[PDB]
Ligand binder design. Structure first.
Ligand SMILES: N#Cc1cc2c(cc1[N+](=O)[O-])=NC(=O)C(=O)N=2
Ligand SMILES: N#Cc1cc2c(cc1[N+](=O)[O-])=NC(=O)C(=O)N=2
Ligand SMILES: [Zn+2]
Ligand SMILES: [Zn+2]
Lengths: 258, 258
């Protein structure tokens, strides 16, 4: 059979080729995860077709209906065989799907407009002149919320009662708010995205300080999948071959603009 | 049955307590992995006994006999139920034992004696005045060896023919050679170890440059062990609870001397 690989339109992981209107199948797409799926399928010896997730979501369980959305849903309800995407390895997800060992590391990070006098979380917490927020619904907001940790507890208090709202509907909106804030807004988001935006014109943003946590993205397969073991080993092999670092350099820095 | 947990005397993961003659069993030991084993056993709901690996090795396969030594061997041949140690997740190992998702990240890093005019790998590669090397057997050496990569190829060519040998028998030997070589030797090693030593008297070493690769330590179990699933979910929960970061800070920085 041709294996179905669910993925997500997130730059630079999966993006449309310029004339994608004119193209067919896997040829429609390019990016880090396009390259990754290609290399994995080579080592696992499978034919495959990329499938863009229909709701544009990674995967969360609705607190009410208990239905999984996004790519996680595609795996659990049997539409996709594997997810190759920047899907974060988390406890609730690992309970319902299997992940490979991480193909990329990351953590919560601070994005500022260049020139903003901020160099760390501690810098943000003590002051109020510069506003800061996060995505309104993800895992970054949860880190601060479910964080029994000093300075981050102070940050959460501020964010939860801030006026108006410092939580953004999308990651992209957060980024735009930093850019248009004249230095009065900072945004917390995945380090990999922060690093990516720092490489986009007009080069007006910067990542500052260390990461506040540590996580990995993994390739996902359903429980009991015949592919699980061949996918895990392929990811380890690619790391040791230097491919994964080569792909990150390619899409972040060789193709960067700053 | 009481679970056998194999581990290794490596500071600050597992170390003897002050008057250890006077103590018995698990009470003899303290450290990052002592604390980690206690937390994992708590979530997995098992009674356990720490056992220091007899040969004091992590684990490698003899190229002639094909027999595994170290903690890897203890798992593979049936003498230990879990290894709770800074055991590097690698393809050849994952082929024979199971690993949790990483509890700690790391990469190849450069250790210098303070004062040495080296800030990066590129700095080492373009000169010969200041000698540099790695452990004579492990993944740091193999990174360079099997690295079809520009500056690293140049570094491998140098180290391969350096006279006398720049490869050390032990990591501790490499660290001593940095300290005693009056600014003429730099050592390449695990970033976590580099960072730890930087925090120890007499505070004469420094970690410089970014990491050359990316890897993780994992908690290991025998292939197909019934304990694998819960150990992995335990590590993920501990990370999400912030407790892995708390342990790192405790053993590296709160207990630091520099
Ligand atoms: N890149 C990236 C991202 C990858 C993500 C993400 C958000 C972002 N992001 O927008 O920064 N949320 C997730 O729940 C996830 O599994 N993976
Ligand atoms: N710390 C530590 C270390 C942890 C290690 C190691 C060397 C060191 N070291 O001496 O730096 N070699 C390994 O093969 C391993 O699985 N784990
Ligand atoms: Zn279109
Ligand atoms: Zn390949």
């Amino acid at each position: 059979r041709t294996i179905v690989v669910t993925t997500i339109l997130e730059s630079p992981y999966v993006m449309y080729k310029k004339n994608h209107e004119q193209l067919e199948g896997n040829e429609r797409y390019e990016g880090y995860c396009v390259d990754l799926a290609y290399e994995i399928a080579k080592h696992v010896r499978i034919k495959y077709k990329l499938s863009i997730v229909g709701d544009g979501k990674y995967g969360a369980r609705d607190p009410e209906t208990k239905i999984w959305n996004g790519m996680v849903g595609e795996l659990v309800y049997g539409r996709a065989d594997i997810a190759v995407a920047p899907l974060t390895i988390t406890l609730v997800r690992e309970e319902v799907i299997d992940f490979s060992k991480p193909f990329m590391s990351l953590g919560i990070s601070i994005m500022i407009k260049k020139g903003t006098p901020i160099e760390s979380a501690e810098d943000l917490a003590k002051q109020t002149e510069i506003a800061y927020g996060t995505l309104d619904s993800g895992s970054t907001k949860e880190f601060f919320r479910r964080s029994k940790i000093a300075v981050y507890e102070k940050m959460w208090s501020y964010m939860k009662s801030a006026e108006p709202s410092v939580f953004t509907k999308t990651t992209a909106d957060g980024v735009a708010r930093v850019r248009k804030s004249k230095g009065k807004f900072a945004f917390l988001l995945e380090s990999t995205m922060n690093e990516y935006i720092e490489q986009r014109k007009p080069c007006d943003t910067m990542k500052v300080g260390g990461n506040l946590d540590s996580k990995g993205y993994g390739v996902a397969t359903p429980k009991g999948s015949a592919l699980g073991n061949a996918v895990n080993l392929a990811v380890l092999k690619l790391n040791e071959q230097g491919l994964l670092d080569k792909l990150k350099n390619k899409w972040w820095y060789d193709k960067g603009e700053c």
